[PDB]
Amino acid sequence: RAMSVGFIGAGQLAFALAKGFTAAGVLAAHKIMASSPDMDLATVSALRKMGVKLTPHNKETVQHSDVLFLAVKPHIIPFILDEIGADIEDRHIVVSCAAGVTISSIEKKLSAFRPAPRVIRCMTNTPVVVREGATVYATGTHAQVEDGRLMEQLLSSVGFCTEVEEDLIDAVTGLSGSGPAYAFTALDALADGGVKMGLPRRLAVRLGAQALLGAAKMLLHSEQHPGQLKDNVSSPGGATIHALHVLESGGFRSLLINAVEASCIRTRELQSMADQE
């Protein structure tokens, strides 16, 4: 409650969480801080207005914060854990969200400054900026169960949360992590196809969006199975099952798996590459 946070990063993710948290009525813009190594107008400059504390020094951060956020590239994360390992008290917990980067790697390199540091691996997506991001996390080794509670609660604030054994997190990042982007492609497309029927741009876009939205909810608030709800929507006649056929005839399902697999697989590499070199 007397808690105040910081992101040593910025960029999207930061602004994502930053924004969702503010709007969540949880923290308070000013009671927050992130470091601008350089300054990316969009992000950085955005925040400026939002009401968040920005410091070039991702060290002033470290202090200002009771809960720390690592929102940096997966290869940059090493060069920081050894720039602040020292400046790391025991009052705060570290939530690293860098893709694929392992607790261990963090811990075991960052502990070279503290007997038992407290860290959690996190996996989230941009839609957090509202309240529908999909978040996952795994508890470190030096992590008490009052930290996995603040985490689990701090995030449900902006979406959906759950504990997951770190290993699953590479897959997860494929689905929920990138998914927001599979979606945006989906729609931009639909909008076009919408428009390629008469519908105007603004219009097609929003209905295509609403179309999706709707589907989600139905699937979440029930089991049903995506399969069966599909059945509930296609009258033996056509118009829908017909659109399906085409999708089904261009490997639509397929090209989504390959996107998950690929997303996943890239994350595997990126980390199992930062392990040696």
XYZ file of C-alpha atoms in Angstrom:
277
model
C 0.000 0.000 0.000
C 2.886 2.309 0.707
C 4.200 0.488 -2.339
C 5.517 2.368 -5.357
C 6.871 0.833 -8.563
C 9.398 1.227 -11.344
C 10.358 -0.168 -14.782
C 14.031 0.018 -15.672
C 12.771 -0.102 -19.186
C 9.997 1.749 -20.980
C 9.003 1.205 -24.592
C 5.706 -0.456 -25.088
C 5.381 -2.985 -22.286
C 6.203 -0.334 -19.704
C 3.579 2.085 -21.029
C 1.302 -0.947 -21.243
C 1.586 -1.878 -17.586
C 2.137 1.731 -16.587
C -1.156 2.703 -18.281
C -3.247 -0.251 -17.125
C -2.097 0.194 -13.543
C -2.909 3.890 -13.480
C -6.343 3.389 -15.024
C -6.790 0.392 -12.686
C -6.908 2.970 -9.875
C -4.189 0.935 -8.211
C -0.938 2.797 -7.999
C -0.763 6.450 -9.067
C 1.130 7.783 -12.064
C 3.472 9.913 -9.983
C 4.181 7.045 -7.589
C 5.919 5.290 -10.491
C 9.258 5.437 -12.244
C 11.037 4.230 -15.403
C 14.405 4.924 -17.027
C 14.900 6.386 -20.513
C 18.147 5.092 -21.873
C 18.004 7.580 -24.892
C 14.224 8.613 -25.132
C 11.698 7.203 -27.638
C 9.247 10.030 -28.082
C 6.221 7.724 -28.278
C 6.918 5.779 -25.074
C 8.999 8.149 -23.010
C 7.374 11.367 -24.173
C 3.936 9.673 -23.871
C 4.445 8.815 -20.241
C 5.649 12.370 -19.582
C 2.024 13.391 -20.001
C 0.575 10.295 -18.324
C 2.183 11.317 -15.050
C 5.061 8.896 -14.481
C 8.556 9.628 -13.115
C 11.211 9.252 -15.778
C 14.904 9.270 -15.095
C 17.763 8.720 -17.484
C 19.393 6.724 -14.685
C 17.831 3.292 -14.334
C 19.362 3.388 -10.891
C 17.369 6.215 -9.281
C 14.608 3.922 -10.317
C 15.861 0.990 -8.295
C 15.514 3.114 -5.210
C 12.235 4.855 -5.962
C 10.739 1.389 -6.258
C 9.553 -1.292 -3.880
C 8.580 -3.675 -6.764
C 10.875 -3.722 -9.775
C 10.147 -4.163 -13.423
C 12.626 -5.392 -15.988
C 11.095 -4.345 -19.302
C 14.235 -4.515 -21.401
C 15.495 -6.490 -24.367
C 16.469 -10.083 -23.504
C 20.146 -9.490 -24.243
C 20.274 -6.119 -22.444
C 18.987 -7.644 -19.239
C 22.442 -9.065 -18.426
C 24.141 -5.663 -18.653
C 21.798 -4.308 -16.027
C 21.619 -7.136 -13.480
C 25.382 -6.276 -13.064
C 24.866 -2.498 -13.000
C 22.369 -2.663 -10.168
C 22.895 -6.084 -8.614
C 24.664 -4.040 -5.993
C 21.979 -1.355 -5.675
C 19.490 -4.138 -4.945
C 18.074 -4.109 -1.453
C 16.004 -6.890 0.013
C 12.893 -4.793 0.530
C 11.922 -5.164 -3.132
C 10.953 -7.955 -5.542
C 12.043 -8.192 -9.178
C 9.652 -9.030 -11.926
C 11.558 -9.667 -15.126
C 9.419 -9.755 -18.217
C 12.128 -10.035 -20.800
C 11.135 -12.864 -23.153
C 12.796 -16.244 -22.634
C 15.291 -14.929 -20.003
C 15.449 -17.449 -17.097
C 15.080 -16.808 -13.403
C 18.257 -18.745 -12.739
C 20.379 -16.725 -15.169
C 19.022 -13.634 -13.386
C 19.284 -14.907 -9.873
C 22.601 -16.682 -10.385
C 24.502 -13.567 -11.449
C 22.444 -11.067 -9.520
C 22.882 -12.997 -6.244
C 26.526 -12.053 -6.627
C 25.347 -9.036 -4.525
C 22.761 -10.445 -2.114
C 22.469 -13.764 -0.183
C 18.861 -14.373 -1.315
C 17.331 -11.977 -3.876
C 13.596 -12.067 -4.577
C 12.617 -12.493 -8.262
C 9.624 -13.515 -10.473
C 9.579 -14.251 -14.214
C 6.649 -12.597 -15.928
C 4.934 -12.979 -19.284
C 2.466 -10.382 -20.423
C 1.089 -8.582 -23.490
C 0.187 -5.073 -24.537
C -3.679 -5.450 -24.116
C -2.810 -4.935 -20.477
C -3.217 -1.217 -21.354
C -6.873 -1.867 -20.777
C -7.583 -4.746 -18.479
C -7.400 -7.682 -20.790
C -3.725 -8.465 -21.009
C -2.845 -12.123 -20.460
C -0.257 -12.515 -17.719
C 1.685 -15.433 -16.428
C 4.445 -15.719 -13.923
C 6.782 -18.074 -12.099
C 8.209 -17.718 -8.582
C 11.933 -17.596 -8.031
C 13.710 -19.789 -5.493
C 14.146 -16.958 -2.904
C 10.489 -16.017 -3.218
C 8.101 -16.000 -0.268
C 4.389 -16.588 -0.790
C 3.448 -12.949 0.022
C 5.253 -11.810 -3.104
C 3.455 -14.246 -5.411
C 0.366 -12.782 -3.853
C 1.207 -9.107 -4.542
C 2.180 -10.202 -8.064
C -0.902 -12.311 -8.642
C -2.958 -9.419 -7.293
C -1.072 -6.568 -8.830
C -1.683 -8.038 -12.284
C -5.316 -9.255 -11.999
C -5.697 -5.546 -11.633
C -4.986 -5.307 -15.335
C -6.004 -8.677 -16.761
C -5.613 -12.332 -16.098
C -2.907 -14.050 -13.950
C -1.545 -17.468 -12.973
C 1.452 -19.297 -11.669
C 3.174 -21.452 -14.156
C 6.286 -23.511 -13.990
C 8.748 -21.314 -15.906
C 9.368 -23.943 -18.652
C 5.774 -23.530 -19.956
C 6.419 -19.801 -20.275
C 8.277 -20.162 -23.560
C 5.167 -21.709 -25.103
C 2.899 -19.231 -23.403
C 4.762 -16.314 -24.846
C 3.953 -17.789 -28.232
C 0.242 -17.845 -27.629
C -0.791 -15.032 -25.292
C 2.397 -13.016 -25.715
C 2.267 -12.506 -29.467
C -1.397 -13.305 -29.962
C -2.343 -9.689 -29.555
C -0.385 -9.201 -32.808
C -1.924 -12.214 -34.635
C -5.145 -10.503 -33.833
C -4.228 -7.117 -35.280
C -3.282 -8.827 -38.512
C -6.528 -10.764 -38.457
C -8.560 -7.597 -38.249
C -6.652 -5.312 -40.593
C -7.384 -8.148 -43.017
C -11.097 -8.465 -42.140
C -11.426 -4.722 -42.358
C -10.122 -4.943 -45.911
C -12.298 -7.882 -46.799
C -15.065 -6.093 -45.047
C -14.420 -3.088 -47.266
C -14.024 -5.336 -50.288
C -17.768 -5.845 -49.927
C -18.988 -2.306 -49.696
C -18.530 -1.603 -46.032
C -16.509 1.499 -45.183
C -13.160 1.371 -43.423
C -14.082 2.651 -39.940
C -17.176 0.491 -40.005
C -15.632 -2.853 -41.180
C -12.796 -2.464 -38.704
C -14.998 -1.896 -35.653
C -17.488 -4.676 -36.481
C -14.600 -7.054 -37.256
C -13.178 -6.066 -33.908
C -16.541 -6.445 -32.109
C -16.937 -9.686 -33.968
C -13.742 -11.022 -32.273
C -14.470 -9.565 -28.867
C -17.791 -11.296 -28.816
C -16.287 -14.646 -29.695
C -13.707 -14.443 -26.887
C -16.241 -13.865 -24.086
C -18.434 -16.689 -25.208
C -15.467 -19.005 -25.146
C -14.171 -17.805 -21.765
C -17.534 -17.871 -19.961
C -18.103 -21.530 -20.777
C -16.297 -24.578 -21.932
C -18.270 -25.492 -24.942
C -15.012 -25.907 -26.982
C -14.235 -23.530 -29.846
C -15.328 -26.406 -32.046
C -18.928 -26.624 -30.894
C -19.634 -22.890 -30.723
C -18.558 -23.033 -34.340
C -21.431 -25.419 -34.907
C -23.844 -23.082 -33.048
C -23.043 -20.381 -35.573
C -23.286 -22.150 -38.932
C -26.858 -22.758 -40.230
C -26.802 -25.913 -42.482
C -27.398 -23.510 -45.271
C -24.382 -21.342 -45.714
C -22.930 -17.891 -45.471
C -20.823 -18.990 -42.472
C -19.869 -22.589 -42.968
C -19.107 -21.395 -46.443
C -16.657 -18.740 -45.248
C -15.218 -21.548 -43.155
C -14.624 -23.882 -46.048
C -12.322 -21.229 -47.578
C -10.400 -20.747 -44.388
C -10.233 -24.509 -43.978
C -8.975 -24.685 -47.536
C -6.069 -22.345 -47.011
C -4.815 -24.051 -43.853
C -6.055 -21.201 -41.606
C -5.742 -23.261 -38.448
C -2.344 -24.392 -39.612
C -0.865 -20.949 -40.215
C -1.732 -20.110 -36.607
C 0.018 -23.032 -35.053
C 3.155 -22.305 -37.107
C 2.867 -18.822 -35.606
C 2.631 -20.102 -32.055
C 5.427 -22.676 -32.674
C 7.598 -20.150 -34.333
C 6.985 -17.517 -31.675
C 7.777 -20.107 -29.037
C 10.783 -21.547 -30.826
C 12.277 -18.087 -31.323
C 11.995 -17.457 -27.594
C 13.689 -20.781 -26.890
C 16.640 -19.733 -29.103
C 17.018 -16.192 -27.977
C 17.575 -17.433 -24.385
C 19.370 -20.739 -25.151
C 21.759 -18.473 -27.063
C 22.286 -15.891 -24.348
C 23.267 -18.877 -22.141
C 26.728 -19.218 -23.607
C 27.624 -16.260 -25.752
